[PDB]
Amino acid sequence: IDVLRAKAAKERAERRLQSQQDDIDFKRAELALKRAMNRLSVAEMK
Protein backbone atom coordinates (compact mmCIF):
# COMPACT_ATOMS: atom_id res chain seq x y z
CA ILE A 1 0.00 0.00 0.00
CA ASP A 2 2.62 2.52 1.11
CA VAL A 3 4.56 3.46 -2.03
CA LEU A 4 7.45 4.31 0.29
CA ARG A 5 7.86 0.72 1.45
CA ALA A 6 7.33 -0.72 -2.04
CA LYS A 7 10.11 1.56 -3.31
CA ALA A 8 12.49 0.73 -0.47
CA ALA A 9 12.10 -2.97 -1.29
CA LYS A 10 12.52 -2.48 -5.04
CA GLU A 11 15.78 -0.63 -4.41
CA ARG A 12 17.02 -3.23 -1.93
CA ALA A 13 16.24 -6.13 -4.27
CA GLU A 14 17.77 -4.32 -7.24
CA ARG A 15 21.08 -3.88 -5.42
CA ARG A 16 21.09 -7.50 -4.25
CA LEU A 17 20.43 -8.73 -7.78
CA GLN A 18 23.83 -7.32 -8.74
CA SER A 19 25.37 -9.89 -6.40
CA GLN A 20 26.89 -12.78 -8.35
CA GLN A 21 27.80 -15.06 -5.45
CA ASP A 22 24.13 -15.05 -4.47
CA ASP A 23 23.16 -17.25 -7.42
CA ILE A 24 20.29 -18.47 -5.25
CA ASP A 25 18.86 -14.98 -4.83
CA PHE A 26 17.77 -13.88 -8.31
CA LYS A 27 14.99 -16.46 -8.00
CA ARG A 28 13.52 -15.02 -4.80
CA ALA A 29 14.11 -11.43 -5.92
CA GLU A 30 12.27 -12.31 -9.13
CA LEU A 31 9.11 -13.54 -7.42
CA ALA A 32 9.18 -10.59 -5.02
CA LEU A 33 9.43 -8.00 -7.80
CA LYS A 34 6.59 -9.63 -9.73
CA ARG A 35 4.42 -9.46 -6.61
CA ALA A 36 5.30 -5.86 -5.75
CA MET A 37 4.61 -4.83 -9.34
CA ASN A 38 1.19 -6.49 -9.37
CA ARG A 39 0.18 -4.64 -6.20
CA LEU A 40 1.34 -1.35 -7.71
CA SER A 41 -0.83 -1.83 -10.79
CA VAL A 42 -3.97 -2.47 -8.75
CA ALA A 43 -3.10 0.48 -6.52
CA GLU A 44 -3.18 3.02 -9.35
CA MET A 45 -6.49 1.80 -10.80
CA LYS A 46 -7.75 0.72 -7.38
Side-chain angles (χ1 to χ4, degrees), residues 6-24:
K7 219 242 288 185
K10 239 165 97 237
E11 232 234 59
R12 221 256 298 287
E14 269 292 272
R15 206 93 161 74
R16 267 265 266 290
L17 200 146
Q18 187 239 323
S19 207
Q20 302 256 111
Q21 274 200 37
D22 308 330
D23 198 48
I24 63 121

Side-chain angles (χ1 to χ4, degrees), residues 1-42:
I1 310 296
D2 232 42
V3 66
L4 263 100
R5 290 176 111 73
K7 219 242 288 185
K10 239 165 97 237
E11 232 234 59
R12 221 256 298 287
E14 269 292 272
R15 206 93 161 74
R16 267 265 266 290
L17 200 146
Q18 187 239 323
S19 207
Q20 302 256 111
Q21 274 200 37
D22 308 330
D23 198 48
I24 63 121
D25 181 88
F26 176 80
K27 298 187 159 240
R28 238 114 303 178
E30 181 166 18
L31 208 152
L33 245 291
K34 180 122 200 272
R35 258 225 197 181
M37 241 190 116
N38 281 347
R39 277 235 166 73
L40 219 66
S41 191
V42 183

